[PDB]
Amino acid sequence: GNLEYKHPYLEDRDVKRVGYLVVSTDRGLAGGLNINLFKKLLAEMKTWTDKGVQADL
Amino acid sequence: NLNMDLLYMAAAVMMGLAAIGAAIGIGILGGKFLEGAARQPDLIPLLRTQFFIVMGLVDAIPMIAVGLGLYVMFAVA
């Protein structure tokens, strides 16, 4: 708005490591739901760990 | 004669007091104008408008006193 603040959560910084909040089902018989998600996550976590930044889940 | 010795003091006071009054009054009145502007810029034209509208009413008695002080310091003295 007409004023702005320097709060951390609003502006970027150097990515030294990333956090992921992973939502999964508690029950099976859902088909591929969980595994598609985990594969996508693993791909992007691999990207980030190639740049040498750890990740936390 | 003795008149020269008191009038140049009476006017002095009569105008220094009006100085104090107008100075402090306008300082205070403009402070809130600046804080409002810094709070909500682009309302500045409207703030300035009604500021000048009000400010005109602050000068009344101080300027009357200045006028009468001068009317004494020269036209009476």
Question: How is chain B split into domains, by residue range?
Answer: 1-77
First and final CA of chain A: distance in angstroms?
A: 34
Asked whether the beta carbons of residue B41 and residue A2 sit closer than 8 angstroms, the reply is yes
User: Are the beta carbons of A33 and A25 closer than 8 angstroms?
Assistant: yes
Segment holding A7, helix H or strand E: none
B40 touches chain A (CB under 8 A): yes
The length of chain A, given as a count of residues: 57
CATH class of the region B1-77:
mainly alpha
| CA dihedral of B23, B29, B33, B34, whole degrees rounded to 10 | 40
Q: Which of B14, B11, B21, B15 is nearest to B58 (CA)?
A: B21
Distance from CA of A6 to the nearest CA of B (A): 17
Residue A20 three-state SS: coil
Which segments of B40-75 does DSSP mark as H helices, in order? 44-58, 60-70
B41 touches chain A (CB under 8 A): yes
User: Are the beta carbons of B5 and B77 closer than 8 angstroms?
Assistant: no
Q: Which of B57, B54, B71, B61 is nearest to B10 (CA)?
A: B71
Method: cryo-EM
The CA angle B15-B22-B20, to the nearest 5 degrees, is: 55
The amino acid sitting at B54 is V
What residues form DSSP beta bridges with A55? A18
Q: What residues contact B27, with CB distance under 8 A and at least 6 apart?
A: none
User: Are the beta carbons of B15 and B68 closer than 8 angstroms?
Assistant: no
The amino acid sitting at B34 is L
Gap between the Cα atoms of B65 and B37, Å rounded = 32
Q: Is B5 considered catalytic here?
A: no
Residue tagged active-site, from B47, B55, B59, B72? B59
Resolution of the experimentally solved model in angstroms: 3.1
Residue B41 three-state SS: coil
What residues form DSSP beta bridges with A17? A54
